[model samples]
Target: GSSGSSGMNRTAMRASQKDFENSMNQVKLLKKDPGNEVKLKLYALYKQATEGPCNMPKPGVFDLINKAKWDAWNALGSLPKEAARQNYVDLVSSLSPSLESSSQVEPGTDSGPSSG
Candidate 1:
């Protein structure tokens, strides 16, 4: 049985979840790899979003790549699942601008520069 009385907004959560799915597909279509650092970020955020917190034991120190990946996921300690998903979508969009235009657009809205 699962716990009741969750406070998360279902509408927003669903929207972000959809965007996350799309981003995963978009990443696969990239013309070039986004480098190790960015890939680690995507890995960490995806883990945090999909698996809650990082509870697995740390990898061996000699296993540098897994160690780094474990550290990144653990570093996001207790961040809300929705936040993790949103961040993943944002990061993917930044890496691929074409995704940003295709994934979302509000009707009758413009991105004109505003005077500060």
Candidate 2:
């Protein structure tokens, strides 16, 4: 006998996961640096999405860049992983509108502003 099954489907989660990966790749292809603040935001969202809350020790004061990254991640404090992934995708899309064109050409799974 088949038991009643009621559970959230993973299709949406998998879609977001792919969007996150796509954003990472697209960011690398960027011609110029997106600047420090934007970079820090990306770092924070990536960390929050992949590593969860920032529980690790902060970087030393001398490590200015890392310290700033840590602060950004810490500022996200308890944001859910899915939300972080979505934010990362949105940021990447804003940074590179061209991504929308190229990504649309690829087969299977689309992200970024497809919804109304």
Candidate 3:
């Protein structure tokens, strides 16, 4: 008998994957940097999404950036991979043009630019 993930878990897993992919695409589409703090968040989320909890040795004192990156990843602690993926998706989405606006306008709403 197959012993893989079941219905809801499988569905949620796929959702996380889609979110992760969308977030990654947004990252590539970004032209301007969002500063080191935002970048660190992205890096931590990416690592957590792809690698799960941090398992590497902390960087040496001289390696400040790596140390900060390690700290960010380690701070994620026990966050589930899927949850981390969703966080990445949410962060990227907020920074981008927003998925909601990309979709069709609401009922009786104008699609053109506002004069306000």
Candidate 4:
């Protein structure tokens, strides 16, 4: 049916559109990151990429991790909530521990106040 095909195409378009939009937003956020809005946006993207908030709709870990990388980078702040932060952190630990632990590769002393 034409309607069914059209609907399918629309759905496909929407999904790809979101990815393109998320990626574009990520790049913009990287350039300025004004008010940490970009960070929030990135996390939102991650949630969508992973499935949903609290990892809802669970789309397997590998896919989740692959999408989360872009989200994690956009998340520059300490994250507002401890649970949310831990959830994201745990995602990293579980999926990409080595990439996650790359932190020590460029170690730096605490010159300024840190939340943790």
Candidate 5:
């Protein structure tokens, strides 16, 4: 009886251990997807910039920077006459401090905003 029940208990423990291993594998999969995380963050920023603080209408600077240049310009086409000036102010202000002064240093790449 001892050998039989002990064998059954060991099998049950192995099944539980396998479940924990699978959970850990799922965590590894999620951790490895940094690109997806970046895309999602960009999407959230797009929604905030275009639809929230920037009440300036479609094709704003946020749209051009976050989406496509052509799309932003096209959206600007439908705006009132002063839309360009309104957005230019906001766009210029969004420049990062890293890109602002002579101290601008991007640890990895020598390229400025113009570079990929």
Candidate 6:
């Protein structure tokens, strides 16, 4: 017996968690690599979702990929884990629309839109 306020929030969190897991699986099934910017977004979102706040120091100048990853992740700032999860789901869906449509399907079933 308690206020109803917390229940809705909990539901949202559970939904985000499920979506996060689904999105993670969808990641492995992605078609062609989604390019550098999308890759950076995916990397940052994955790190933020799993690792909480971004604490690692920026990479050195010559480490181009790492530097980009650092900046993308650092941009997430102190975003909540659930929010990061949702963002990752949304980003992946955007990067691979087929994944979005097939999100409800089991992972590894279809490897993206059939080119044939």
| lDDT (10s digit) by residue, model 2, range 16-111 | 677788898888888897678887888898999999988879899999978999999999999988788877887888887565423333468867
lDDT of 1 by residue, 82-108 (tens): 788887887787777564334454589
> Considering every candidate listed, which one attains the maximal TM-score?
1
lDDT of 5 by residue, 1-104 (tens): 34563343323221122333333333344434445434333333333333433344355565646445334343444444233333332232232222221222
Q: What range of 10 consecutive residues in model 5 has the weakest lDDT sum?
A: 95-104
The residue pairs that clash in candidate 2, if any, are none
Which regions of candidate 5 deviate over 4 angstroms?
A: 1-68, 96-116
Error at 91, model 3, angstroms: 0.3
TM-scores for every predicted model: 0.69, 0.69, 0.68, 0.26, 0.22, 0.65
Best by lDDT: 2
Using lDDT as the yardstick, the better of models 3 and 4 is 3
For candidate 5, the lDDT comes to: 0.36
Please list the Cα RMSD from the true structure of every candidate, rounded to 1 decimal place.
15.1, 13.9, 14.2, 18.4, 24.1, 12.4
TM-score of 2: 0.69
Q: How many residue pairs clash in each candidate?
A: 0, 0, 0, 0, 0, 0
Q: Kindly provide the TM-score of model 5 when superposed on the true structure, using C-alpha atoms.
A: 0.22
Candidate 4 or 6, higher TM-score?
Answer: 6
Ranking by TM-score: 1, 2, 3, 6, 4, 5
lDDT of 6 by residue, 7-103 (tens): 5353433335667777777778767776687778877888888898889988999998789899999999999887888788876666555643333
Which consecutive 10 residues in model 6 have the weakest lDDT in total? 6-15
lDDT of every model, 2 decimals = 0.78, 0.80, 0.77, 0.41, 0.36, 0.75
Q: Per-residue lDDT tens digits of candidate 3, residues 1-116?
A: 86666552533333347566777787878899878888888888889988999999989999998999998899998888878887787788778775742322246756887797
